[PDB]
Design a protein around this nucleic acid. Sequence first.
RNA 1: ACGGACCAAGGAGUCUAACGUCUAUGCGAGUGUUUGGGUGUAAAACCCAUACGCGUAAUGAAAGUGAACGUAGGUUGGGGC
RNA 2: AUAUUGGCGAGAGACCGAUAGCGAACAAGUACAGUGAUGGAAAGAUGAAAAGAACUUUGAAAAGAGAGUGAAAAAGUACGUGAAAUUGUUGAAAGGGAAGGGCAUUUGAUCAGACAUGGUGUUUUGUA
Lengths: 126, 185, 51, 127, 52, 148, 49
Amino acid sequence: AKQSLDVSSDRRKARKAYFTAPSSQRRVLLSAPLSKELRAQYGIKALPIRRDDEVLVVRGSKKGQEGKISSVYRLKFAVQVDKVTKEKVNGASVPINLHPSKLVITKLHLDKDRKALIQRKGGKLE
Amino acid sequence: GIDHTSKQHKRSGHRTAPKSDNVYLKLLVKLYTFLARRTDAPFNKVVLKALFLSKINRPPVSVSRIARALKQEGAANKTVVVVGTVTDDARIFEFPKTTVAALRFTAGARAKIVKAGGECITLDQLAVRAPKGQNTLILRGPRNSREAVRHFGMGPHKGKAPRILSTGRKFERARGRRRSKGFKV
Amino acid sequence: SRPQVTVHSLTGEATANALPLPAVFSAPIRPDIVHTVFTSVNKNKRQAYAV
Amino acid sequence: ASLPHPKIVKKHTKKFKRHHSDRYHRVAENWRKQKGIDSVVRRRFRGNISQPKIGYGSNKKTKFLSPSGHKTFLVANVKDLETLTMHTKTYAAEIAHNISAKNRVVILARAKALGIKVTNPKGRLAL
Amino acid sequence: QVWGSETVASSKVGYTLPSHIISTSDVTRIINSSEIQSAIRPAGQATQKRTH
Amino acid sequence: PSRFTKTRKHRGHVSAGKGRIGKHRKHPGGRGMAGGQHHHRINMDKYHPGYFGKVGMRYFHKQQAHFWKPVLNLDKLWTLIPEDKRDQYLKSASKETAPVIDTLAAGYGKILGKGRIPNVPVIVKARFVSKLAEEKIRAAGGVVELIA
Amino acid sequence: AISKNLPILKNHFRKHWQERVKVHFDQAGKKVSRRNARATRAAKIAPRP
RNA sequence: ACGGACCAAGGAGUCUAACGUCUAUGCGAGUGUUUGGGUGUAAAACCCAUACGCGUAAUGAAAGUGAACGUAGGUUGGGGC
RNA sequence: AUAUUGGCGAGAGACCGAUAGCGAACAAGUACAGUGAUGGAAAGAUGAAAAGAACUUUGAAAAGAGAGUGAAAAAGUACGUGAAAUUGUUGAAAGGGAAGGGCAUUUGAUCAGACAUGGUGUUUUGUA
């Protein structure tokens, strides 16, 4: 619970820091869970979403539809997927943006900074 | 069209109920009304009137005035009755035994009475030992000895205490307080 | 002649250890004094506000 | 199936409207006392409306009784439904307006198994 | 010990448990008794007879 | 609280318990003590006789140090000994055991006469006294000590 | 103005004292930092009393 | 005689300092923790020292003084016993 | 150690809630008025996602009927629900220089409860 003087429980300072969040701390505000498959290859449970990731949807009117991310929208706090899109009436097709908390990761993309974070959070990677 | 020679729905000027919320008082009053019904004794009737009195009408009865009652006719070996609390008079020295049947007893009062060889019983215990009031001696408190009662009835030539925090000269002792400054009241 | 109260352990059960009582339980109970004093202590844990 | 009560009379059956509630859009039906010194209605004149006074009280043996002869009782659950054991000919059951059609019928069926009357069985009946 | 009793102090200076003014919790027990059931004359009806 | 105020019961009567003729005004007869020697001396003659005029004299720089004189009467006296030592020097009224009482230590100055005590010899260290108290002290058997 | 039988009032408030008031809400707040200066003195000013 | 074209939202005997009347409450010739210290679950809560205001005596302009002859008297009326 | 209605960084409130609270939740001391010194606003909300009206036809355009979109257009960039004044329209009714009103009843429209009760002899009954 609340025991420290440096933490705030105020709802306005939360929806203020959230509605006016910078892009660097935005990759933070948009973290996503792994699968039990990935929770056994590393042991970690969280990690922000990126362009080169394959994520599955387990919630909403898209119950059971996976795909590879096209371009994540930090501006609105979402992410587009090329395999999960919506068509319009004029015939034009425009992808869909959703929240990464409902999207569990199946496949990940590792680089220099990515493998460093695996050991930093408490994993074993591969 | 009846002409009412006096006044309408005029309340007796008494209390049919106590202006208090004491849980133990609702219990005390209940048993004394039971007696004012089936005994006839004038005792339970005047005592039932004291259950609706204020602290002004229930002044603290001191044990020095109680010691005066033991030195009188009939109260040598009689029990005393008190309406309210009992205060310890650190002004007396000698006292016998006897019994006290008061509502309350201050720590100080209850100490010297029981220490001198006496007892301090509540209203209810002595009520069972004396149903109609057999061997009782009830007393009152100094009502017209209050700070407020002094300032009641103030007018010229009377002398019923004037209200003011500060005492001494320069405080209502000028014009109208000496035969020299116009007059002296 | 104390009323006595049975001791309990962490898994429930009553213990053979019967003990006397503080006696503040056989004392006066005034729910009316509480009423008035309760509204007073609530004002103790407050703050202020102006324009 | 009610308790021992006589013939229920209410005296004044019409409505007790406010003054000018038929003359202005600003004035409502709610009874407001007129404090005007030149109030003809307040001075109990001939030709004005009747003011509601204490003199219209009802007998305590037929008071608060609905059209059937039962004093109302509002319920929200089946637990307050059981609290009317020896109060079935004394009171009549009724559901709240903010409840859902499904939970209300489980209580309406539980109420008939006991012997209480429901003055609103048509509440949200989808046929 | 922190509140005292009839034998120990109270731990608090100038403090002593509140004073009692009654005897029993149940007043129908006091009013019942034995000495009281004697000094009381016969009862009534509990619900007056409407004469006339 | 605003709830128990009857002002809420005037929220319909219009006038709000202040009349309809002279009604409620700013400062009707004035502000404060204005009118004492003038239009309001009627209430001053009675109730407050002597507010205006002059008393005796003026005291420049007055200090209640030379005026610190709390008094103690024949009434108390024994109150300055714990009951465990008060009745010990009471019951057994012997000689040369005269309980030395310090009025200085109790926060006093002068002594007076109010209403008797028993016949036991008592020695006390006090500042000032009275003629009446002085007499029932010699008759009791005790003495007084002069403290500065 | 002059009315009823009551003690004459000597309340001096005929000023703009609406700008001269003292708020004592920091009373308990000062008591804490009062103690924090003492624990800092006993700490900064060596193990001396 | 004066305001009032209509409808809606706001819209006026207050807060607090110092006291009096009545009332409840605790203590009781004493009384008031929140002025301050300790402690801490944290602006809360709980405990405490020392002084102080008011009361426990008045009276005079002031130096100054200051309430029991008598079971703290007698008379008249008096509740209750 | 005493102060603090400006600046700066944090944690709270029995505060207030779009005629409120700061003039100011927004391109705000901005628009805008004044020679100027100065004065000083109105304005929050579509929708979970614009997924924002493609397309046919009539029309000069705006749009209409539809369709399609959409969980819901009684959710459509004049957008959440949409109070009264005022108004459209169908249905009703009254009215010979006011309307409307109190109390009684005629008629029009409309609505509640009550009815079962409780229970006895029982040719003996669809499956206790």
